[PDB]
Design a protein around this ligand. Structure first.
Ligand SMILES: [Mg+2]
Ligand SMILES: [Mg+2]
Ligand SMILES: [Mg+2]
Ligand SMILES: [Mg+2]
Ligand SMILES: [Mg+2]
Ligand SMILES: [Mg+2]
Lengths: 9, 236, 236, 9
């Protein structure tokens, strides 16, 4: 999984 | 609830301790207890709630993806039959993940969203609603998958409409909402052109508003703009 | 137990899946279920048991140390009183940690150790017994702290006696036992000279036995010798 | 915590 969402781990 | 006898302030204090200890299940249970006290959440408290459940559900999503990959491998051609165990355990993790999503959605529905009047709180909670329907959608395969997807879309859309009316284009909440809605379009709605368009337009409109910001807000906003750009680089 | 209706082989298969998914609480519950089937454990199964509980208790130990540090900070001079919450939550984590240690010790006592006749299994389980009494000792402050420490020492000592009689000095089980017993001496028994002596003698005797090993066993043994050296560098 | 024991996390 390369997409970025928020909040991040 | 098991947190019913603890003071709201102590639940918040222990949620912050659990975060420092990287005990995110504890952190989430503390913040669930705080929400169930029935008072609205401050900005800091809303972010504690989001961080706690994001870390819990993030572990479950990572685990589900590992198990789903193994399960698909076992259903390939020439793959030796190994019994029901892989499916059973993927289903166990999936059910626990859905339970966490239902818990968050239940908190938003009873009664965080209906009490949230300010744009910053209302957009925050509607983004959360979209996020946790999106995580449900990631594992959905049945008759209500379309309805789950539309519940994510509807929540994101109401959040977007409010954020565009009430917040500047650099507002971190607005930016993070658009980031996540763009990934919804790409990953869930099979609309990569909508995803790219949303991310580019969001980035460009924030870029043009940076001049209005203090050094600290500039750093807050550019951090999330970089995530928009990271996705655009992935996608184009 | 909740695993009573699942086949032993399926519990082992799911423990391995949980490891791949980094779901160590699940992994531990699966291996507890496998142990409670009542059959002895193979070498691979013993290592699944150890890996599962080590990861569970390792998260709790890291969390307890964070919370203990905060608690000591709050008990310093000029430190503002913040109520019982830090102590309460440290106690919550500590109790959960002790519960995990008691669970492992109960599995060893009912009935893994009494059925283990071969040196490789008997030394493995006695090392585990020493390890989990050591984790109890790390948080112990009451009247039975000395007895907890002596239970760790006694288990380690019986394991050492068997390992020296029945195993070569490069045996990874023997090496890992001596590594951990040496840290017991340094950290728990306040005997750093014993810790250093044990680590040096263990390292030197393994060094002189390396010539007997295959390339794969050489790599297995030197990996643990390096940990002995790492501690010696820390301590001298 | 800098000391090394086995198994490791
Ligand atoms: Mg009160
Ligand atoms: Mg299962
Ligand atoms: Mg196109
Ligand atoms: Mg059977
Ligand atoms: Mg507590
Ligand atoms: Mg000396």
């Amino acid at each position: 999984r390369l997409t970025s969402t928020l909040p991040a781990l | 609830g098991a947190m019913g006898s603890m003071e709201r302030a102590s639940l918040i204090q222990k949620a912050k301790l659990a975060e420092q200890a990287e005990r995110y299940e504890d952190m989430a249970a503390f913040m669930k207890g705080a929400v169930e006290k029935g008072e609205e959440l401050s900005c800091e408290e809303r972010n504690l709630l989001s961080v706690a459940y994001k870390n819990v559900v993030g572990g479950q999503r990572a685990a589900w993806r590992v198990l789903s990959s193994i399960e698909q491998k076992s259903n390939e051609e020439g793959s030796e039959e190994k019994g029901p165990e892989v499916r059973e355990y993927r289903e166990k993790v999936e059910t626990e993940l859905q339970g966490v999503c239902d818990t968050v959605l239940g908190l938003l529905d009873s009664h965080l969203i209906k009490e949230a009047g300010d744009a910053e709180s209302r957009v925050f909670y509607l983004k959360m609603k979209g996020d946790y329907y999106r995580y449900l959608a990631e594992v959905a395969t049945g008759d209500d998958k379309k309805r789950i997807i539309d519940s994510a879309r509807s929540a994101y859309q109401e959040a977007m409409d409010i954020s565009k009316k009430e917040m500047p284009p650099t507002n971190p909440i607005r930016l993070g909402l658009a980031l996540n809605f763009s990934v919804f379009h790409y990953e869930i709605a099979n609309s990569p052109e909508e995803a790219i368009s949303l991310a580019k337009t969001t980035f460009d409109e924030a870029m043009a508003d940076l001049h209005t910001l203090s050094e600290d807000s500039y750093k807050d906003s550019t951090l999330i703009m970089q995530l928009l750009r990271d996705n655009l680089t992935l996608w184009t």
